[PDB]
């Protein structure tokens, strides 16, 4: 059979690709040129040696179908799949203008040249096929350099996206003109041509979109089956192309492009193992396709093409190379007035790279082989193949090698001083670690006599990269140094999962954009562009909710019944539109019986709802459709004008009333869009707030100048406050979406720490490897089920807020008491709930709204639902520390200090209510104190809070003296009250970090300021 | 074209497999039965609806070639690839006996039944095809249960290996009898039949072995190219099959089996990413093959088979099911007298599982489809397909579901108390961690109002599994508790890379075997089976080294010349054996010119070496071959008997002398085999020593009974000492191999810690993600280059040992001094180098041999090259602490205390020589002290040593008082000398762990016992 033999030839191609790719890794020329050389050699061998000709001929040629329907889909999908979708969408308008118009203009100009330069006397359709071939690109070799050098990352994204769209549209143009040349048909009317344009250009992406959304839907519902996900992705990728191109005659390649982009975007719905597998799998297929195409080009160019090449063809080829380079540069320059004003903009030297980086590749060669096959004996196939191969070789030899020197000359290969210094520091760190390990290993019993001259050489890692004027100098130093601290903070937040990858990239992009620009800091108005939702979706949401504003089984039954009955309707009316004696009778009978049994909705609803049945708007349509069907059924017991109008009405009216059930789902879709935008804005805002709170502890130990310190601290806080206000406003604008976004991240954090506990048990050897996977898989299934959480969650009632406060969360009997003794208060904008210095009246738990707080230790921040205000008012029993003002309509539970005192004095079990309240206060006191001692040591706020979570209040009043052992402790904070050192007799009367040299403490009955102390176990 | 359509059908199969696999996950029946049902439905549809018949018929049938040459290789290779090779090799004799003989006996018995039960009147060849089909297996559904239950892991390995070999040999038997039935040929002679048997049974595995070794060779030389590795593996896998089955007519399937097993074994030569990709890729292909085969079976069984099935065929099918189950059980029982005495043995209930677990699968169905296609219109194809499908369905419905209940009834589904308790503890740990994180999250500003009723329910992980008599009870408790501590230690050593995976599995197997057996502890003689090298390779090594015992370019030129000239020789003599006028003349001329130019070896060597040229043995053959060629060339200037003998001699003599160059490489091969065995033994011994040294610190805090304590401590040390002796002996037996094995692990440890430093910088955000990958890739390329390190490394000279001692390793001027003042001593067995209580004479650095040490703090251990003996003899200047005796011929550098005192008093820079010596002493003192405080806390010895590596000696004598701050320190050990507490005035005169409550220390001029103190920075 032929299939084993083609697999054999594919494996031969595999090994030749391996050889070429391995040996010429040193040399600058890419391996594809070596594959062309090998193809040429194999061609001459198979020509002069018939013993191998008769074997190889059977596989040496490829039908147009295998090219256009296997190779091109693979290449185009792999290109669409490896792309970073988000930056592409960020630059879509620029990349799409450049691709879709530059392709047309470049192909037209190339076709004009091919008619006027070459003596081949081609007509315009042939020249346009030629231009479409010569306009394809393959910059995989250049985007790699732009990624490695790191400079102008947006340029790499733009070039790659342009290549993707350019290749897709080039294939479409080729498919048109190939038909006009090799499969001519009679002149179609303008209307049919317009429909054909819409079929290829508009139906394609829409078909891809539909299949992509269906595929991601199903992928979101598969668990513990990597094979099913992989298989579904592959089957969808091929069926999209085949059904599009063959059955629908819709542009398959564009649908495949859209499918790749969408599936890449929705990567969160795919388990990570399947993600990495799919990336490597499509890379492998693209590699095989490239090797096969290049070797086939060499073989057939020696066998069939070069036998008909004249001395003038080489001159034409050189002129063509110059012409296409000039055309591409001219196109880019001509659109520069537009591209400069959209997306990323376009620097001159970026335009130079984009011109020079236009490598041609496998797509053009595959199209040239299609032409060569279809042309048969005509010279046009040989001319096409020769010129395409010549251009490919010239670009891969000249451009693909000189691109590096061009990057150097234009001044872009220079790696920035920041990154160079970071690399040098990291290398020295690694080197010191190696030195330590070398010493230990030398000081060991078993490996004492290893040849260290070999080992030390073997491990050596080496560097890969090798007064007011003074006040402005120091200011620019501090500016860049602070932005570096912000970058570090954003990465640290990412690694623990406080940040989504997209939020991280947004923040890092804003930080590097702020670094290169003069006198700049991260602009809060550039962050606001995230959570400021575009009004389209809110508009739609309120509209649909307005539009949607008797047992449960009835509507389920009727909604099923519509789907059931539409099949008879369409079956009959399509037949009547197209044009068994029992079948038409059976269809009419089915219509009549359906109309009869529709009493179970019509009259049942009329009687159940009573006279007011018609008040509900949709029941009016329910009556109307029955009225129409009654007449058009009664007619049967009594012409063209009857039937051709009934076939309109009895279809149209029956499908319409399904929208009543459809709207609730579109509401969910709008909610999902709003949820995604709100979640991204929330993540970036929270990340920025935390980054400012962390960098605002580092700067006090990192700039000396006590004027630059104040200016940077002011810029930091004036940025922070706007965000903390706006995030509070977002909740009020869209409550339930925010509630869902909060619950989701809560679960995510819990699951991450559960995985870390599992890995700790695994590394400690307390849990088997096979048991570790079994637990981890449940962790992952829960994590994936997070993606299917409702996009909106109903906000909890206030009693559920009381039920969940950290200190209330315990005894049901205490919760019942607090229900029995509480009051609910409501306040308007600008009402001030708390003043400084007033005596304690009770505790406030805010259940709605946003409040601003102010007071000297200043403290200008805000609080929101679930926060408790006046925490120690009944513990310390002293004048208020701060003022609280309503920034919004605010609702709180107020429980009087008289109400507290009873429970305070009565709930005295070992998990004491006073103990719980003081611990809630102590964590808040302790966190800044721990940070001020460790922010430069590298911990984040959340690890600080988890570290303090293990701690407990010191059980004083057993006796008023204590000293501790570090074998049972690791940190101490004095929260409140008066204490004094047992050795030095120095008093401590402040919230203080108890330094680790403080040996022994003693206390006394300063009854107004009684002590509390907090300690952490190892 | 046909290829796009077959891809479409494959994608349809993909989606049906996805549906069946997803929906029936709850139900017990496997999805393949659902695929058969779907195939049946599709068959009846395509039968009664010609509109889809005309479309589907083109793909519905499959040629025998696509089955036998695509599907079967894929299935067999995937089976061979997923297998754990090492346990399979450990049980190979048992599994191979059972597979290769049970297959023959079962197929013969089934064929006899098929002749005698069925009225089909088959001949013996047809019945043997039938038996070969019915003897195939597919236990993938049962080995999964045996892996999940964890009981009888060896049984899972045995069943899986039996299936692999059984399927391979069944395909071979089928290929024989299919030829005899459907492609008959004339009766061959017995000799040709014997050659055919050798061609199928012996040449197959050898061809697979050759391709496997070549493939792993090339894979060992590829770096930073995952695609090349993947591509080469796939190309090799298919070319092995194709070249074997088609060009060589050698059994392809067996070669594929051997290739899969070998490539799986050599996984260390493949980058891990390529490993996981290949596993998932072959799983995917096997899944596709299974789905396609089952659906095709359903389609064709409805279209062609069931139309010719009678009421008696069902009775035959049921009788056949019973018969094959009985036959398999009988075979297993009959071989039980043999299988019980080899490999794993065979428990009765294991035999019951193996009988009931014999699921049939895709291989039998594919062979049945081959028969059905070849039979054409004959009833035999329908009978074969019907019976095969019936057996498959019966086994998948009955056996595949009842296997779980059988495992329960026989008493194997019960999970052991140890694992249940471990799971309960791990679950409670995870639950407590979730509780902590829940509390913190509640005590947070941003997520305060998340619906915790949703979150807490969402994250909940749940348990998956739900007096002398008293002295013996306590003894069995301590025995099992110690073995559990050993298991933990072996896992902890693995996670940091002190152990190879195989060494870990050896130790864990020995630990669990020792746990289930009564009154048992890990037997040192079971560890010895690792490093006790079988004598074959040492024998070969010495033999080849004996056999192998004038400018450099000459031999390179001649070794190339032999390879060059053999091509003319073979080209001429094959032609003369087979039977251009210029070509034969040119060949003779080439022979004569080669003989003439061979003067450049013959006479050049004779003159260069002189008269004694003939003394070297190989020069005698060099002269002999020239003598023979001279006569047979001179003949041309003067018949059959001439030519047919010259064609023997002038070939044979020319190839022989290449063995002189070949032997040096075979020496390397033998060295590699010895290296692998020695390395595995070394790893297991070192792991056992460290495990005993760690568990020997835990037991003092883990058993109360001070008699069971002594007995277990004695069993531990008496095991340890034998290993520490034998590992010392191994070095002397095979020096350079041991040196290479030491250097390799040194580099491995350094690279692991370098990777950890990189990940630390990455997590701290100090290094970019893209920079982190760039460094990590260099780390990985170095790690992979470790695999190509020489298998033997020449032992360093003594001056290189002096050059590398931890304290000598510094100033070149000090090294020069030590060269200037040193002495080298040699000692025999039983000479005692050091006695207790003698005055200091100097320091010993051992450069060769093994010495035993003894002394009260007892200390009964050994030391080896690179160890220094008498470390503080010139520091403390007091009577010796211990006795040292030569266990072997021993050589040491002895440098007199008089020689020390000068350098001690002169090398006083900041990196003081005395400082370095005291630090070398201090680490040795400090390590046990840190372990005794932390062994139960979970640290290993190596993390202890790395922790101490950061520490330094306290710079006393600035003033004799000090106190420290934990913000600059983390641990303290007092090494030697006299100190006293500043507050309590208590003296300290012992090597002591300075507990963290010790605030302040003071010292004094007790000149005989001056103090040294060691502290660790954070």
Residue numbers in the entry:
A (entry chain A), B (entry chain B): 72 to 537, 571 to 653, 676 to 705, 725 to 783, 794 to 1012, 1031 to 1191
How did the manuscript describe this experimental structure?
The transport domain (TD) is accompanied by a voltage-sensing domain (VSD) and a cyclic-nucleotide binding domain (CNBD), which are regulatory units usually found in voltage-gated cyclic-nucleotide-modulated ion channels, also referred to as CNBD ion channels.
To investigate the impact of ligand binding on the conformation of SpSLC9C1, we solved the structures of the protein in the presence of cGMP and cAMP. In all cases, we could identify prominent densities within the CNBD corresponding to bound nucleotides, which were not present in the apo cryo-EM maps. However, we could identify key differences. Although image processing of the cGMP dataset revealed only one dominant conformation, the cAMP-bound dataset displayed a high degree of conformational heterogeneity throughout data analysis, and, in particular, the CTD was generally less resolved and mobile. In most of the three-dimensional (3D) classes and as observed in the 3D variability analysis, the dimer interaction between the β-CTDs is disrupted in the presence of cAMP, which causes the CTD to swing away from the symmetry axis. The observed flexibility in the CTD is also accompanied by a higher mobility of the VSDs, although at no point does the VSD approach the transport domain. Further, the extracellular tip of TM1 rotates around P75 towards the symmetry axis, pushing the TD protomers apart. Minor conformational differences between the three structures are β4 and β5 of the β-CNBD positioning closer to the bound nucleotides and a slight movement of helix C towards the β-CNBD in the cAMP-bound structure. Here, binding of cAMP causes the disruption of the dimer interface in the CTD, conferring it a higher mobility (state 4).
